[model samples]
Target: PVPKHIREALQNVHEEVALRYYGCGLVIPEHLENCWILDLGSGSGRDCYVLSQLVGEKGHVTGIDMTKGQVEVAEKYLDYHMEKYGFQASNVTFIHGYIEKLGEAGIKNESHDIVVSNCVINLVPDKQQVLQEAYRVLKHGGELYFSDVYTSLELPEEIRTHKVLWGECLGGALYWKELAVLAQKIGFCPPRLVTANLITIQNKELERVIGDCRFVSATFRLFKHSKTGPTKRCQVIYNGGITGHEKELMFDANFTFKEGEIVEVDEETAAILKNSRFAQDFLIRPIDIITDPFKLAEES
Candidate 1:
């Protein structure tokens, strides 16, 4: 289903062009106004047009795809969207390039505010290179929010090599643990799972072919600057001013914040909020409590 928020933006897209796109999630982090964006595996520019509106006039979206037919359709409407959005100039561009090698497109290093992808990473053979490129292109403190198919356990060779399954986004599914370890090795923070839904196999033959594997459509967000290793105790206070999250904010499935409530967190969690675009929405502080027995007696 097209989400209500993105539905309006989808209107600017050609129906033919829009049909060619299939991505995983809309779990974009808040506060993207005027922030430059890059869409990896941007087939047909569906998500690009949506991001164009959210970023307003000052920001622009760069989309890349390996398919010439998709690129042709995407750029065909380039001028039409500019006029529809009342922009004096177009704020979106579609490029023919590989997601695993974004530099080929001449997109400057560290030039983007956010990198988004939908169900496309699994289609690439070198997933690590794609992650590396995404890390390279985003400005420090930027993020990659994407959705893709994942397996509950190691993928079996049969399904992994099946031609039909591969195109359906099921054959190349990564084990959740493998993806986490690889993402961290590439300099991304531990991936935070945003949302996940079970993929139902409608074809009985395909279901039989999959065996015991469980396929999930999962959305995850990773940050470029967030580091790993031991972290200090920290806390965050939501200021309650972000448009829809004025009452509370759910940082992810793991953390939720009530307005004005100070919640203790690990240093990594605190850093993600303090360092990213969401920094403005929160008040961050070190955890302060009387830990020493000597000080505790005196304070009491």
Candidate 2:
């Protein structure tokens, strides 16, 4: 959850004049060296400018924002940063465009290495289309990093219908269960939540209007190419004398599974694994590996 001071800073920070930041975590992967990154809903270029410094002069950053005022603010800082870093004035570019309509902004297909959003996707009503466009633009092995509001329980009918809640990033919050299913349906793997916090509404008037609805802000990571496959009925056995180290062997964000544990993989997930590009590295057998290597017999 954003602290009171941070929230006040965002409200009075003159986003159109300087930096506009509403992020929860640093979702930038360590492998982003020399990769092209796209910041969706990049208000005032705060994330864009940070990415610029991270990716260096050899890499490029593109920001898309719908508000002209925010774009103007970002553009000014972008110029200043480029000159400050002794860059040649082309390291970053800002475009005025909505997240759902990025294709209209002339962003080429399958070009970006990463797509990021900070507390913005909930504002758009068509979240499905927004994710579809994200998948359409990201190259293989790319990732989508985002932070937004979510709900653990369903909101009341009256609260759902309120306009103030909607504008304040609460009415449109995605249910946690629905978000998981939607993401998987659109070719994204199950997302992992990095940050979770319950928000308390301190404003008495605002609380009265919203009623008994509780809200939480969560940050998630959705990998673009994590293959989903069919359930494999197999058991992993630990040989005798092998010491178990749970702390050292625990799976991190980069590694998804435990070494000695067997988990079920559904049919759809298996098919995805069969065609995965990383099969060679994972030591999984490829389709071509089992085929006959000899050519056809010569005709008489």
Candidate 3:
């Protein structure tokens, strides 16, 4: 689901770009009015066009894909979209490079407000570097919001090397737990499960190959912030704005808030809501006592 304005922007994209789409997630983050966004594995520029609309003229978007043909298809539309959006100048760029080596593609360090990937990280041989590059390119309060295929449990080594399975998004799939661990170990706070759904393998052979490995089309949001912070209790009140989230905003799988309804959150959660792009839409206030993490752990 996308808003009408977003769809309006998407309508202008050529059928050529639209038909070649291989995207697997819907990753439109909130509060993106004038932000800079980077899309890894942008594919045929379908997601990039929709994002170009959402980010608006003031905002800038860059899409990088290893496939040159796809990148060419994406780059070929720059002027078309620019004319369609009627911006003073183009607001998007398409890059042909590996997601693991963004620096080689001219992506500067700590320069992006957000990074998004669509079902493509699984194709990369070096996912750690992909994430590390993403982390390195994001500003202090930026976040990585992406969607990908995940297995309920880790796959067997034999399954990991299956070429057809990998192309179908089954091979090289990280277990859900490993996803959280990878984010944490790479200096991000524990990743939050924003949304998730089972991915049914329609092919009978693929299904047979999966065995016990269940698949999911899941979206996650990970914050680039202090892994260790003081423990403090706070109340969160979601403001009545943010387009579709006027009434309620679900921050993650566990945290949900209604407009003007006060909800309790700990220091890290509060910081996530307070210090990120979400800062403007919520009011966070400290509760009576603010204790150190060790003290709170000992008391509990």
Candidate 4:
């Protein structure tokens, strides 16, 4: 469910801006006050406007999209949102550039604390280049939180060749496992599955072409860290201070950390929590043994 504060933020945006939203899932993360964020494929500025409020007046958000129409619509509402939020200056900027070339868009390296996108990566043919740019622009410990379509099987060229399918975001979808390997190669932490649900094709024509291949809309969080060495397993306790998640923090699909409960995490998970903004909210201690997140879920 969307948080109350986020819903309130949505209400503050212009109706026209909110109406053009095309994102696949929610992009809002906790502890966003005063954060600098970059939005890839920001359509009509819906997410940017919502984030402007969440980040407050002191924070900033930059949006990039290849489409000129989308950027113009997003830029048109800058003053409205700033006035609505009562900020002295507009805190958001929309740039017309490809998601794969953020440096050309003038985004400085290690500038943003968090990078977010909604159902955009799958559209770009060079998915690796897009991930690499995201990694390059983010400061160490910054996160790449995004939602996109993924497939259960590798799609055939017959389906991929269909322009309609590509327009619908089904043609270019990556296999789920492929994303994990891709992120690791790009030097980001293992992709943590936050939420996923099956996607149904309502058109019989599309379904016939898609065959038995299943599609899913999944949200994932990937963190950038510079360490090359291994990290040890650890027990972490949530301090109950994250605004909307005070009772229990849903760190990912595999873990739900209740306030003050000691939960054991694997080396990768431990490294992610310790390196990201969550480090301040969690009390972490190293342990000798390792625990598999999937195994823990299956046993439960």
Per-residue lDDT over 133-244 for candidate 1, one digit per residue giving the tens place of the 0 to 100 score = 9999998888888877777667778778887677576766777677778876988888877666667777676777777866776677888884555557788899987655
Query: Could you give candidate 2's per-residue lDDT for residues 54-86 as a string of tens digits?
Result: 667888889998899888878877666777567
Considering lDDT, where higher is better, how would the candidates rank from best to worst?
A: 4, 3, 1, 2
- Give the C-alpha miss distance for residue 202 in model 2, angstroms: 2.6
Q: Each prediction's Cα lDDT score?
A: 0.76, 0.61, 0.78, 0.83
Q: What does the lDDT come to for candidate 2? A: 0.61
Candidate 1: residue 120 lDDT (0-100):
59
Report the number of clashing residue pairs per model: 2, 10, 0, 0
Lowest lDDT 10-residue stretch of candidate 1: 289-298
- Between candidates 1 and 3, the TM-score winner: 3
Question: Which stretches of model 1 miss by more than 4 angstroms?
Answer: 1-5, 12-27, 226-231, 288-300
Model 4: runs farther than 4 Å from truth?
228-230, 288-300
TM-score, cand. 2 vs. native: 0.66
Best by lDDT: 4
Where does candidate 3 stray beyond 4 Å? 202-210, 227-231, 288-300
Model 2 lowest lDDT segment of ten = 291-300
